[PDB]
Subunit: 553 residues, 3 copies
């Protein structure tokens, strides 16, 4: 039990002294190592990455003068900008005014060919989001030239009027926005900001000269991406200020700096029915003479959306371990490829065609030696398994099918090469129809099992193997068999029928080992009737019938 | 050195021709491959996934008429909606009005059983967030029926008044919001939007008919998730418009489309003390007659939060390599399982009980052959390691413990099977108390080391192995030992005491190899005293004392 | 073909009964298993993690009284807070007022040493964001003491005036904000909220006593992180309420609770030129006597940014499979380490120096046995490969280089150990200048190939190996060679020149196997001229020239 615990299994290997294969192995190992290292360091797969949480604080500075009796106006942050001071801020670039609005009946603004021509056309009680009123069903003259439906809404109405061109607040392109970005990686417990001590304040952002200046001129934002602020100012738009944080929190590779990029977020070619641009209608309410009045301003502008994103990486042992474990199996590529080469070039097909056709692959025949020193083929031992050898042939035949009452001599199997004998050890001092030697005899086994023993020493007519002197020296010589038995059992009693049986079995084994060198084939070999019966004649049984070949399993 | 570099180690293998094991191996390989492929393609583990950055632009369109002297009002986007046009927008569904507010003393609104009954109950200088004023400590009659505390706050007060039921702006359910969603994957450098050219504009969203229409009717939003807009309109709520982007950026599998889903974000059963619903109090300031007055509107509505989330996948070679490396080791499952089967069925326990009990597992005994052709057991060579063989027994005994002065014959070890001899090679032409053969002699070694040599040829009384003829043929025959020595050293000088010593050692080795076939056991074998001293008698030393067994290590 | 499919390859192994190595293997296996399990469960690597989508709803409650003719004011949520009720909300802590603003010429506010001293200093048409007006180029006296430039802007101007100290709305520290957080994991289809049924309402958040109370006192927020609300109230700031959701959605380990933490998001030491603190200028517009007037309020306060982040993990089989596959290769660590130990201690370097220097590593010499039972070295069979043995030496010499016309006897290779012979099997019954034995003869091969056969039996002068009796018994004995041939071919015809050739080849093989035990070396061995020519003399050819050694490949 404890001995079972205290065991270590190590694979048997074959140390090959080959320049080609060693060079290939080291080249592939180096390639795998290089790619693994490159992937680890480039993608920082050894680091735990966490997304950031951002806080944005914007301050827009800039004033515009608008001339529109002539009225001279001044526009500051309490005028053209909203209380928006975070991820988004709005800069007004144009506007439409409608002073003194009261909820009453009035003609809807004639625009986009909405002028009415017939009273029946207008509907009663119909909600009109385009005009923002309820039509009363009666057409009325908005102007002496054209007529429009009557809506109970805020009056006077100015819906559908185009934004003035050129934009009144074009000067917004000269306005400067300061962006303060605070990010944190709570898992990594790291916080930083885009404005650090020792940074100049009289700077404006540029891709090259001042890439870290958080002060942006809107016109520069637009022209860095090929957008015409003057055109966008008319109907408005949405622009994006991307702030990317590719941040490394490792001490030896610490750099957490923002990268500023810009992107228009509103489609230039939005259909006129999809409300192009960016605008919003905001109203100031007041009391006049005793009635509640409203002043409506339709403000066109650019909404700047500050989009902050990024990841913060810090070394994590678990991630590195996982990556290494993932990539470890790639170091078996050399083994796989070289074993594939050995297996393929060990095939008896290359010599036939490939080598004569291509003579450059001639020295690759050495892989047969490697294969035979690397692989030990074996077959499943099954009852039908049988091996036969014919002295007129230089190979052994394996039969792995049932004998359906037909002689094993006539049964056909497949050819296999007889194993090489141990030279170091060998260097020492009315006959049956199926019989082609004349010495074979009918089987005494039951009828259903006579086919197994119906085998001859040779396939073609000739002399029996029993005529060879080695048959008598090895198989029939009682002295040699006695020596073998004593070698196994030194104090054996060479008397009785037991010794005759043991000698018979040793003779069978001797023939099997002589003609089927491998013990694997010798165990499942089948002796010819001639040799079997000569053996039995030499070492015969008493008051018993021979059983024959047993299944080793 | 370079020869050390130019080496390739390949494992020795056993090619088994088994239908069952090959079928099992291929089945398991196919299963592993199928699961790995399924996981790779379903979860898109070959792709690098990046979260998106979103910009949302909303446009709500819809007008409501409210009747509340009778006052007829019109409510448009400058009235019921806020400047919110991004990720969130607010649609007012009800309201409470309080015109003409001045900062002075007044009775707090009697609500939720807040009516005061005693002057002492009211506190002086106490902040009252429920009433939003500082109590003066004196109770006053709010109405002829009930009394309330006096607060220096905006007056007249209307706190705690329930939202009117039914909701005044019920018609908000018919209002339509257009959502424009712009997403980007900056790492993958991909941008898209939810409105593409060629999409109809007179559409409203439906799960099946118009799943890609970014125009939503609020009532439809509510009824798609079993929410009653009429009820929510009273106190308000929060609704979520989820926009999911499961986007594949690979050219051959490119589809980046949004999936719209809805979710109520406010708890229906919020406790009345936790401010249920959604409302906000916004005030319009003005000057009246010389004093600064305020108009307060408590607006109840639905805040729609557009929640945009998703990931964009693009093929990455590094991710695929990592996944493949992770899954490569799963291809050894076939080897593990089949080797486990071989090891288990090679145990000498199955034959004893399992096979007779269950006869279906009879042909699985072939795994003993596979085990013995796959594993070569070996023991750690240690000084205490000793092997002994008794000619009255068919096994060898291994002793791996110290001899505490007691004879090795009486010491007990564990039984091991003597290895099979090479048949191919063999096929060729006052006695001591511990002695059970009569031919053994006392050891001449030092007293502490006599136990090692205190061993007999047999455990039970009988004839000595020295009486066998093979002992003289193999161990004592000077001709055979001389032939062996010459085989090792052809030009050996067969004269002197050196040749006698060499013959003695060869005789020891011959006995050890004969009775312990394996060289591993023969190296650590222990000769019996009888055989040892017969050998020494045949090849005796001169002017010296025999040392005995040395430790091969 | 199908037999090729029905094959299973299993590695040959060596079962070592070693306490040290088994203990090491199990220790390393346990260590790897423990670390893998720890990483899996601690980091929850078996779970699929999804980021959350959050909705935040805030309700600030609290009223302040400000005394500033003396004016007594009341400040409620319609006064000090914005319509912000989501991820951010603003609490006003101080303010500056400027009533009755009109767009006209006026002197800019003298602050930060901006007082003008010369008319020429002021510029005409110059935008002044600091003063928020267009300078007319003429200096005018703002006050009797100091003068400032003239700006066409809103007047009276109050830019650059410091926030009053102490802060007017200090009482904001006593105000309470209720945060309702709704999160969802749409991939995992899980939603939850920070307020659950059965939670008290009269609670305020504390780290220990009430960590789950979503009602926060602002002063407590500030003092939990060492911030002085009274100081921040003057100029304002930005504070962050982090809500972390480390949520496990597995039923057996379900806990999805928020963790509240606070963080100041505005730099305390922001440069005075970077607009420290948080403020915004919001204006109320009105009509007075017929002209449009403006009231400007510069509000200083704290903007609270609710930052919600977290991940939701649920068991995923794919992730667990990937992690296990990643970590499987780490279970080969025991094999790697033990094989490294075996390889290192099998080196013939330790015995020389390490063991005598350090005697504790003495019993580690057993690894040579393990190495020789684990590895079978083999060399690449190449035409230049040759083996030679000298009977005056105890080793075989391998030559793997071309013979540039110089005798192979004088060519130097590298020494290798002759393999141990099978004891079990052996236990059975004007001479050439390069010649150091006298029996060698010149080669009859072509001139370019005579060097191969120019080899002697010994390196130093002495007796030829042919004088040994084993040479005649093994190599020249016709009986033994005939027996070997018959063993290979039992019915061989021992007549003709074919038998002589076969005997010659068998004699070459016999010498090669005798002196180069391994068949690998015997195949590429080179016979000495003396032995070769004695053999040929014994078994000579007829009407033909001998070819010599062939390349087995
Ligand atoms: N390999 C092989 N073994 C055989 C053959 N015939 C008999 N044997 C072996 O010899 C034994 C049977 O001996 P047998 O002649 O029947 O003598 P008996 O059993 O005493 O009657 C079995 O254990 C077989 O393994 C044969 O043709 N081939
Ligand atoms: N395996 C084994 N070897 C032995 C035994 N006795 C002696 N030897 C070997 O024989 C050698 C010692 O020979 P020994 O009889 O002492 O002759 P001496 O050394 O010349 O006195 C050692 O190298 C041992 O390996 C034994 O019982 N078993
Ligand atoms: N290993 C080895 N084999 C040899 C040597 N000389 C001859 N042979 C073998 O003997 C065969 C050639 O026999 P050879 O003497 O030329 O007789 P021939 O071919 O009939 O003229 C070849 O197949 C060689 O493998 C030698 O020095 N070493
Ligand atoms: C999975 C690929 C395996 C390929 C094996 C091919 C073996 C060829 C044998 C030969 O030609 O000698
Ligand atoms: C890398 C595999 C190369 C295989 C080439 C096979 C050439 C034929 C050899 C035989 O079979
Ligand atoms: C088939 C793959 C290419 C193999 C090249 C064989 C070269 C030799 O012959
Ligand atoms: C990459 C491996 C294939 C290239 C090496 C081929 C070597 C063939 C030699 C023979 O066989
Ligand atoms: C870790 C599992 C290892 C199981 C090995 C069981 C071996 C049984 C031997 C037998 O019954 O023959
Ligand atoms: C898959 C493993 C099956 C093991 C069954 C073992 C049956 C007993 C064999 C012996 O031991
Ligand atoms: C124990 C696992 C089941 C093994 C089945 C054994 C079948 C035979 O016997
Ligand atoms: C899944 C592997 C177990 C099923 C195969 C069992 C085969 C047993 C044959 C004997 O042994
Ligand atoms: C990669 C590391 C490999 C180290 C192998 C060292 C072998 C030493 C041989 C010895 O000293 O016996
Ligand atoms: C774990 C590796 C330890 C190596 C120690 C080598 C000691 C010298 C042995 C020889 O070579
Ligand atoms: C070199 C690494 C340490 C090896 C320790 C060797 C101990 C013995 O000797
Ligand atoms: C961790 C492995 C190294 C420690 C074990 C060393 C054992 C040396 C024994 C000899 O060789
Ligand atoms: C570079 C460019 O095309 N600029 C144009 C400008 O010419 C045009 O006057 C203006 C009107 O919107 O739009 C912008
Ligand atoms: C609350 C409300 O006004 N709902 C209206 C409904 O009455 C009307 O039938 C429908 C068709 O116009 O539009 C919606
Ligand atoms: C389907 C349903 O229950 N609808 C109800 C409606 O019956 C009720 O009049 C209204 C009042 O809030 O709330 C909603
Ligand atoms: C700045 C401010 O008003 N702080 C007050 C403090 O004076 C008072 O003692 C406490 C208890 O009501 O509440 C808070
Ligand atoms: C603990 C602490 O330093 N508190 C200070 C307080 O002393 C100071 O009066 C106030 C003025 O801003 O700022 C805060
Ligand atoms: Na692996
Ligand atoms: Zn016959
Ligand atoms: Zn015959
Ligand atoms: Zn005895
Ligand atoms: Zn004895
Ligand atoms: Zn010579
Ligand atoms: Zn010689």
């Amino acid at each position: 039990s404890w001995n079972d615990v205290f065991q270590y299994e190590t694979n048997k290997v074959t140390r090959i002294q080959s320049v080609n294969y060693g060079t290939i192995k080291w080249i592939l190992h180096m390639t795998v190592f290089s790619y693994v290292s490159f992937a680890l360091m480039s993608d920082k797969l050894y680091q735990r990455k966490e997304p950031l949480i951002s806080s944005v604080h914007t301050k827009v500075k800039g004033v515009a003068e608008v001339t529109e009796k002539l009225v001279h106006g001044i526009f500051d942050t309490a005028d053209y900008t909203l209380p928006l001071q975070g991820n988004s801020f709005f800069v007004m670039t144009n506007y439409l005014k409608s002073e003194g609005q009261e909820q009453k009946l009035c003609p809807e603004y004639p625009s986009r060919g909405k002028q009415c021509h017939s009273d029946q056309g207008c509907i009663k009680g119909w909600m009109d989001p385009q005009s923002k009123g309820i039509q009363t069903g009666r057409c009325i003259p908005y102007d002496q030239k054209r007529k429009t439906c009557e809506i109970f809404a805020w009056c006077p109405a100015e819906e559908g009027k185009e934004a003035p061109r050129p934009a009144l607040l074009r000067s917004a392109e000269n306005f400067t926005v300061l962006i303060k970005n605070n990010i944190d990686f709570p898992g990594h417990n790291y916080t930083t900001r885009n404005i650090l001590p020792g940074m100049n304040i009289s700077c404006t952002f540029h891709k090259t000269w001042n890439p870290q200046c958080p002060i942006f001129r809107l016109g520069d934002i637009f022209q860095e991406i090929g957008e015409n602020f003057t055109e966008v100012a008319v109907q408005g738009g949405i622009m994006g200020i991307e702030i990317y944080w590719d941040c490394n929190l490792d001490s030896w590779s610490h750099r957490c700096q923002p990268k500023y990029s810009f992107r228009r977020l509103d489609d230039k070619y939005t259909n006129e029915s999809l409300f192009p641009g960016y605008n919003f209608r905001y109203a100031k309410y007041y009391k006049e003479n005793g009635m509640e009045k409203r002043t409506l301003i339709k403000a066109f502008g650019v909404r700047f959306d500050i989009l902050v994103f990024g990841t913060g990486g810090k070394f994590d042992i678990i991630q590195l371990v996982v990556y290494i474990g993932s990539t470890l199996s790639y170091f078996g590529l050399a083994t796989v490829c070289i074993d594939l080469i050995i297996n393929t070039y060990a095939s008896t097909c290359c010599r036939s065609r490939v080598y004569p056709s291509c003579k450059c692959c001639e020295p690759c025949a050495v892989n047969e030696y490697y294969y035979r020193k690397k692989c030990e083929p074996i077959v499943e031992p099954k009852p039908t398994l049988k091996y036969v050898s014919f002295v007129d042939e230089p190979h052994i035949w394996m039969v792995d099918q049932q004998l359906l009452g037909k002689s094993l001599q006539d049964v056909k199997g497949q050819e296999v090469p007889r194993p090489q004998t141990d030279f170091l050890e060998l260097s020492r001092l009315d006959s049956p129809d199926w019989c082609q030697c004349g010495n074979c005899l009918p089987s005494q086994l039951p009828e259903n099992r006579r086919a197994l023993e119906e085998l001859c020493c040779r396939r073609k007519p000739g002399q029996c193997i029993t005529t060879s002197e080695l048959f008598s020296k090895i198989v029939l010589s009682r002295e040699a068999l006695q020596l073998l038995l004593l070698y196994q059992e030194p104090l054996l009693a060479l008397e009785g029928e037991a010794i005759n049986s043991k000698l018979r079995h040793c003779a069978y084994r001797s023939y099997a080992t002589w003609r089927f060198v491998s013990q694997d084939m010798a165990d499942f070999a089948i002796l010819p009737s001639c040799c079997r019966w000569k053996i039995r004649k030499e070492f015969p049984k008493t008051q018993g019938q021979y059983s024959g070949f047993k299944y080793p399993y």
